[PDB]
Amino acid sequence: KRRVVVTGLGMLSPVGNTVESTWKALLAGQSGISLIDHFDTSAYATKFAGLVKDFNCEDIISRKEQRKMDAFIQYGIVAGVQAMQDSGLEITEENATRIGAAIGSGIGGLGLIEENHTSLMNGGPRKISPFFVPSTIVNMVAGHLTIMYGLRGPSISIATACTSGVHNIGHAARIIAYGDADVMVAGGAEKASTPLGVGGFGAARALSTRNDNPQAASRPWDKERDGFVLGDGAGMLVLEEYEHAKKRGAKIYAELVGFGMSSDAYHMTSPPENGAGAALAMANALRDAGIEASQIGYVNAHGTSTPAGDKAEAQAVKTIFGEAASRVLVSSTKSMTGHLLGAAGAVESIYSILALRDQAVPPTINLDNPDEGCDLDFVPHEARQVSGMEYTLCNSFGFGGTNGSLIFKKI
Amino acid sequence: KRRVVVTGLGMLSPVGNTVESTWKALLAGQSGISLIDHFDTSAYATKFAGLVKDFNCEDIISRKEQRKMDAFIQYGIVAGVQAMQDSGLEITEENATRIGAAIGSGIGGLGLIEENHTSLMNGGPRKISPFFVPSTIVNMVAGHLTIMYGLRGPSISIATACTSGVHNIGHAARIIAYGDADVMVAGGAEKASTPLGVGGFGAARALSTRNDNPQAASRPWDKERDGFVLGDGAGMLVLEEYEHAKKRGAKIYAELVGFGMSSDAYHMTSPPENGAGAALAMANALRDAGIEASQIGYVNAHGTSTPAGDKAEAQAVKTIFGEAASRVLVSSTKSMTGHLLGAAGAVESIYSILALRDQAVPPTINLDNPDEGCDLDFVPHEARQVSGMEYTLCNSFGFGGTNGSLIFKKI
């Protein structure tokens, strides 16, 4: 039996370029949602998003090297470098073989696929950049980090839309627990705030259209919800075996103790009003950790601010916690940050971990009027203070009906 | 300890629309490589590919429903339906929860991303199909199958370029062995023979340019190699726990006994001349199965027909098998089929399984002149007959330096 702990955190988000700055902004209820300015949004129904602000990677990645990678990969590396540095791991020739990565993305290099397609349309195939493939495909964030640090252990990339971050982190732990690796860098990165990204989700009418007030648009569980808000970023954690980490004396942030997965088998984009698949994934993670629902203080919800989705999750928490439903705190940090698709599960695992360290729970800002069949404590406007919280649950219920939940324990 | 066996096979490939027809074409050395005719290839350096011929899914998927999915998803479902049917699995309300999927793709819905981008360029965002996202993203093959059969178990999608098929199959087995599922549909699907796909790989100069003779272009380990050949398709297998399958009395094709993963930590597209990462993945799968290299009769090689790549793999087989090197049969079925990227590991696992059933090894067609530092038996022109083969090794070494190997055992 091999235990997995978190020894390093890193991230880029709409409210901060580091872990701690991002953390502090969330506890103060700061929004990261701004108006889009890098492309003309005149014809667009949604003109805002959670954008990464003032991004600099010149020190980490050269300008020469920057040309071979879409922004999602650039975000992924920077956040990856932060997690490696935070962890305090020396990579030696005798170590390489046991350290790998499990980093994903939901859509991957959309920005660069558009550019190259535009080139092709106006110039033919000779104008297609020679780095087309390696700059856009999903597994290149893990490809780049492995080379950079000489990681010769297992390397995977899970692409499950909104559940990517949670699936990657959990399978990195399964890998570690199986014996295939000792350390894993895990997480997700996304940068889908492009014409095709805004338009595409816009075309399905899944996005909020509240352009008059961009920062109040993302309002999970509020009555005026009109769709999710798109966000960019990347979260990354260092996962490693307990005895390996203790032996070197690493910063141990927490322990990954449960991982649950499920499918809805219902609709390609919409969830069951029941919340049946969401319940199952929470149920499975609970069983996987061997704890009851009343031992979980805080649930970082999927909470995307969609009419149908917010109700289902609510209903699924009632079904699992039951009498502890009113006793458990459930908040959506997507009210400040927006939905980071493939990085959503990664950044939100960090929030769930940090909540255990500081005994503070981030709020669901903008919750002015709970939905009619809503009854739980959604940590409504300001951060709540807690005292003896040992477990947290992080939920991701994504497109295609693929669900996941992670359970963390304070050590 | 839970053993995983293969109880159902399904696939669409360039040499056949079914498993058996594909199998028979490979043993006869038939090529599936044709000239591209669905787009103007006048300016293109590569004008050929392994295309799926005479595809019909009207019986499986309606024309109404066909509009919401890229060709890769359409291929994935058809092959998935074949595997479900082949397996003989009844999905009941008491079963749903234990059956899931692990289906990936390397590039996903390229065809539909181009169409939608073209629409956007000529029409603005209102012309973007409302099914943009769900028709292109990688996890939608597993999304569609889960809904179709009511699979409520774990649902993941691994996207590791050329290793996708092998990573998905192996993690489906890890899931099964852990206890999260009893049955898993696993595999990959790809359809990257599009303007951006041919052009993009063309732009990196990774593709063969032998337009005078399309069927002799793919020639792994031959001296005249000038790049890999692109192919479309999808392979799918039903993986399930031994005792579950025996209890219902299923067709047991073989047992998944080993799974190895590694990274090269060298270059984003090129492998180490050494073959170091490839050796490690074979080494790890061997250790995972607990057998030595001399117990493996046949190795389905990665063998893409690239100068650099073919030498590295050769060198990696020498390092692992050593004195059994000349005793072991290694062939590349990509000489007939081409490189199916994310489906390559899935279709080639089936070939490795079928080889055990029929004691016949498919050839590496077109091998007229082995490379100078080549010395192994590459099953050169015609299928070889074998007698007491119990183990086979299937290799996938992909872009980003992500490697994998699967080991199968005859039962």
Header resolution in angstroms? 2.4
CA distances from residue A130 to A91, A112, A134, A135, B110 in whole angstroms, order as listed = 32, 12, 9, 9, 17
Which among A210, A235, A258 is the end of a domain?
Answer: A258
Looking at the structure, tell me whether residues A251 and A201 fall in a common domain: yes
Interface membership of A85 toward B (CB under 8 Å)? no
A31, A253 in Cβ contact below 8 A? no
- Picking from B37, B42, B46, B74, the residue whose alpha carbon sits closest to that of residue B58 is B74
Judge if B68 and B215 occupy the same domain: yes
Q: For strand A296-300 and strand A391-398, is the pairing parallel, antiparallel, or unpaired?
A: parallel
**Per-residue CA distances from A287 to A177, A261, A325, B244, B275 (Å):** 17, 11, 18, 21, 42
Contact yes or no for A262 and B153 at CB 8 A: yes
Q: List, in sequence order, every residue forming a beta bridge with B241; answer none if it has no partner.
A: B4
Note whether B144 and B189 are same-domain residues. Answer: yes
Q: Tell me which residue of B120, B224, B161 sits closest to B398, measured CA to CA.
A: B161
A251 and A347, same domain (yes or no)? no
Packing angle, helices B164-178 and A164-178, rounded to 10: 70
Q: Are both A253 and A263 inside the same structural domain? A: no
Asked if A270 contacts A308 with a C-beta cutoff of 8 angstroms, the reply is yes
Residue B348, CA atoms < 13 Å, CB-side half-sphere: 40
Enumerate the residues of chain A whose CB falls inside 8 A of the CB of residue B101.
263
A143–B contact, CB cutoff 8 A = yes
Q: Contact at 8 Å (CB) between A393 and A170?
A: no
DSSP E strand stretches across B44-193: 48-50, 99-104, 155-156, 183-190
Of B45, B142, B167, which has the smallest distance from its Cβ to A156's Cβ? B167
Q: Is A379 left (phi over 0), alpha (psi -120 to 50) or beta?
A: left
Q: How far apart are alpha carbons B47 and B334 in whole angstroms?
A: 17
Window 209-238 of B: residues touching A by CB (8 A cutoff) are none
Q: Are residues B219 and B284 in the same domain?
A: no
- Nearest CB to A199; choose among B45, B128, B202: B128
* Domain harbouring A336, CATH code: 3.40.47.10
What's phi and psi for B33, nearest 5 deg?
A: -85, 125
**Looking at beta carbons, which pairs linking B66-71 to residues 24 or more positions away fall under 8 Å?**
B67/B131, B68/A268, B68/B131, B68/B134, B68/B135, B69/B109, B69/B131, B69/B134, B69/B135, B69/B140, B69/B144, B70/B108, B70/B109, B70/B110, B70/B111, B70/B112, B70/B135, B70/B136, B70/B191, B71/B111, B71/B191, B71/B232
Burial string for A244-280 (b: 16+ CB within 10 Å, else e) reads bbeeeebeebbbbbbbbbbbbbbebbbbbeebbbbbb
- Sequence-ordered list of residues with C-beta below 8 angstroms from that of B130, at least 6 positions apart, any chain: A203, A204, A205
Residues B353 and B321 in one domain: yes
Last residue of a domain, one of A190, A225, A258: A258
Residue after which a domain boundary falls, among B229, B258, B287: B258
Q: Which residues constitute the domain of residue B373?
A: 259-411
Q: A234 with A347, same domain?
A: no
Q: Are A200 and A274 within one domain?
A: no
Distance in angstroms (rounded) separating the CA atoms of residues A155 and B93 = 36
> Gap positions in chain A, given as the residue before each gap (C–N > 2.5 A)?
none
Q: Do B133 and A204 touch (CB under 8 A)?
A: yes
Orientation angle between helical segments B195-203 and A110-123, nearest 10 degrees: 90
Cα–Cα distance measured from residue A187 to residue A171, given in angstroms and rounded to the nearest whole number: 11
The answer on B254 and B163 residing in a single domain is: yes
Q: Are B362 and B330 in contact (CB under 8 A)?
A: no
User: Cα separation of B62 and A5, whole Å?
Assistant: 48
Strands B155-156 and B99-104: parallel
Tally of domains within chain B: 2
Output the CA angle A137-A162-A77, nearest 5 degrees. 45
| Residues B24 and B99 reside in one and the same domain | yes
Token pair belonging to A303: 């909470």
CA distance A213 to A234: 25
B182 and B278 together in one domain:
no
Distances (CA, A) of B53 to A5, B17, B49, B82, B209: 50, 8, 11, 17, 22
